[model samples]
Target chain A: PRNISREESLQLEGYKHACHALLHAPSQAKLFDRVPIRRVLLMMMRFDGRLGFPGGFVDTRDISLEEGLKRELEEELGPALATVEVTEDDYRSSQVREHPQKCVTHFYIKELKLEEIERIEAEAVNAKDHGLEVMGLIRVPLYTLRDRVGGLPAFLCNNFIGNSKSQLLYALRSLKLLREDQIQEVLKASHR
Target chain B: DKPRPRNISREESLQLEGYKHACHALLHAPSQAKLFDRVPIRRVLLMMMRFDGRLGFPGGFVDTRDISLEEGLKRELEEELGPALATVEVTEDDYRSSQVREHPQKCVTHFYIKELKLEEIERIEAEAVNAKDHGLEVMGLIRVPLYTLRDRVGGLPAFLCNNFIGNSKSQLLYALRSLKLLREDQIQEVLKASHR
Candidate 1:
């Protein structure tokens, strides 16, 4: 890690800020309902063709962190989203340095119902950035299946850009959305 | 803080730029004036080394689970400089720069500059090592000599040219220029030599 000093130029104009939503919808079982009964994360394909979350950069000069994230969600998730304000506590991380780029990323996580997730994905498919910034929606396997994990194998098999993959893994681990033994079991499966 | 796209260009979206988030602080304090001098020596700044190695500044890697960036930085500062003289609290005005200078092991480090008095720094130097601070992170302290047009020396140039660590040499040059501690002419000489 280089010890690069900060400069005033960094404060000038707009700082490159980004936001993301690690949306999840756990499996639901009722008297007689319909759904994809599995823990899932709302993963998206980037225009360049890689796996990631849904979000983008923010202009703090014009919008607040919450609004920045909300706006990105709105643009990608569509009007039916009805997602409310994400507080500072929901912020996962703000990454500023990368080679040859300016970035300050903000990540948010939310748990909702399968119906809402389905609706959000349906709308996202038709959203403006659908084929642009966002290529398509990915139902990340974040749960276990048949006594093992559901998503890790498929998720791991897919390609990701930069630290996005690790960030997902970190969020999954840090947030405790999945148990340690569960992820470890999936890792053991990777030997195949 | 409203919702606007920070970078309208969004150039990095498609490309991969791996960077770790880090923070650094540059502290400035007054020094004892020379016996016959009144102008005061006010150009140098604080630097430190990991008792383990390499010269750098206070601050370290950040984790966002704590919430705000400032909060994370404050935690790192307190860990490294407990009982440090003067308040370590920094405001927005202290920001010097924040950008991704390189890629491929590139890290985005936030840098800040704080000003205190002579007694404050002296007190820090007097008893910081045993203060439960540094925590194997910093072993010693150093001051960056803010060189001027009249002070360029052979050894100084060689030191600047030597590969100390990371992109800190460039960071030093950036700080000197940003803090108005050097003349353009003096910096140019170093730049020419650095390129060679």
Candidate 2:
């Protein structure tokens, strides 16, 4: 609120100014083994064929930030977000992207049931933008540790798009969805 | 993956994302416009948004169809401020550039500062709203109630709390200081109060 000249201050001082989520729903403990667990949402980006959250750049002209977020997810996640409940609070936090371009990614945290995930996967496959933008909907792997039944370990070792790998890990830890020890143990086996 | 694959000269060099092309400005004293039943006599730096109900400066992304940045800015200003701007003289050179930080949404905002008297602001506002020049782009405006010239920095709590569009908030604050409207010590107290 400086009552000074807007131009004068800038000649002196300059100023400069994430997507993360813990998508969990009560699932059989076979993944965590110890207790009920929730699955996280992820996407297999068509670009690098790596995993990342469903979000795209914010084009301020077309829609609002929140609108853009839901639009991006609907494009990539399939069937739109109408069937899903995404509240203002659902968008939990944000993280800034340091490379390519300086910008911020607002993190939207949503919870979907096992059934919901399955239905979404089906719809996502038929989504008009599918194959072109997103290969398909992807559920993060849980069995990356011992049994390794699914391709969980394979995707874990595969390159994640952008800084999304770290972003995902941050969400899990920050949301208290997974403990540090638990993640470390799981990642240790996938580290190649 | 390149604008000019064969490598062109600077004369033909292409303008890309990093280029300083986009713009937004602060109309200080800032009321919604100069015609407010009362001003904040406000060209108050802060402005409210129309599409989304958040507070933001009056401006938009750069549109290429416009002849130049100045032409686009004037067109946007008239559209948002009022149709009366057709008569107002807005010199591109008068706009002082300030604090160019990375604006959100993969754009760099070239913040410009323009000073206008409360009465002239009145004419612009009255005619613009009358002609509905702002269209559906602007919902309304809010004044940064910091007229206490000496305590000019008190609008801290008012600003830092709301949902700002992007860097517009900080850019406006930086402009206020550069304009010598608020003293360092006054802002120091404001900064402390804001944190508190």
Candidate 3:
């Protein structure tokens, strides 16, 4: 069994209470998920009504902040996590909010093959499996900077979904997951 | 006898050869000349050319032989505006230094400012006919909004200035101020005068 510290357990309970209050009800669902792909984490978005990843808290106890994030991902996405690769710089560079409490989220990159995404969608539809109301899925483009064409695909995800998108962008950039040419291909594909 | 010797006089042949030489000299003289006697001037006007067109300027080369430089400009203006411009004044200060001095030709330009009466302009515009090919070609007529050069609201790019010399709006602003068309203080706050 995964170990949970008293402070972590309290923070989780508080977040759960907040979620229950906001939803005007209680939910048995976990907050984040981990996929088999390296560096990729998924979180639930009850506000915008989507499923993404929890990206906002970084702290000292999590062997590295990245490891803590991986733990969160495993608890949420199920035990299929093959790897969680992230840099120390990414976690350190993340925005910290003391008012909401010291929660630091380490950035990560997660790639899901088309088939895996299809399976996730299927499971989401069943409702009993994850109780996730998956409205739609968006593929974050890891290439290119924002310009007049609007924010890059990853930035767009970050803007609409919040820090999870930022974390994903940072992870992709750190790992050099997508080069300029690959980005251009994805941009062209998106247009098509 | 079958048109025997068909002979032209020696003098006639010599005269024909001289005429050919003169034609060749006339054709090629301008290209070979070291310095051009004609003065090069570019004037941009801000008024509509055709009934519905954008406002710009009227400018071109001024030939020396026809008349004085002012007269030549007036003639071109008449061809465009359909009459001699009223209340015209020529200012030496309006001239801008050429950026490219040695390339095409070296020449200085003097700007002529003229304000038209509304009634006269309207009447002339109504009577205006399509100009002949040799006459000035009026591309389009447009309103020159004062805001185009205003430092705060001006959207006109610096490249729009024909010679592309002035780095700031002061030269244009000063020109407008000299014409009593705009106030100096009105635009002084927006532009950096140090560059001027």
Give the better candidate number (1 or 3) by TM-score: 1
DockQ (C-alpha based) per candidate is 0.01, 0.01, 0.01
Interface RMSD of 2: 22.4
Residue-level error in angstroms, candidate 2, position B41: 61
Q: What is the lDDT, from 0 to 100, of the residue A125 in candidate 3?
A: 22
Q: How much native contact recovery, as a fraction, does model 1 achieve?
A: 0.00
Ranking by TM-score: 1, 2, 3
> What TM-score does chain B get in every candidate?
0.71, 0.68, 0.45
Instruction: Compose the digit string of candidate 1's lDDT tens values, residues A1-192.
Output: 122222332363544666787877665431113222246466765544345687777787788777888888877767756554456667666555555676656567777776777567546644655433553455554433443422354335444555576678767787676677766676676434
lDDT by residue (tens digit), candidate 3, B62-139: 554456545555555555545433333323322332211122333333234444444443343332323221111342
Quote the positional error of residue A15 for candidate 1 in Å: 5.1
Query: In model 3, where do residues sit more than 4 Å from their true spots?
Result: A1-192, B1-45, B48-56, B83-103, B124-129, B133-136, B148-174, B188-196
Q: What is the C-alpha RMSD of each candidate to the true structure, in Å?
A: 26.1, 21.1, 28.3
TM-score list, all predictions: 0.41, 0.40, 0.28
Clashes of each: 19, 31, 27
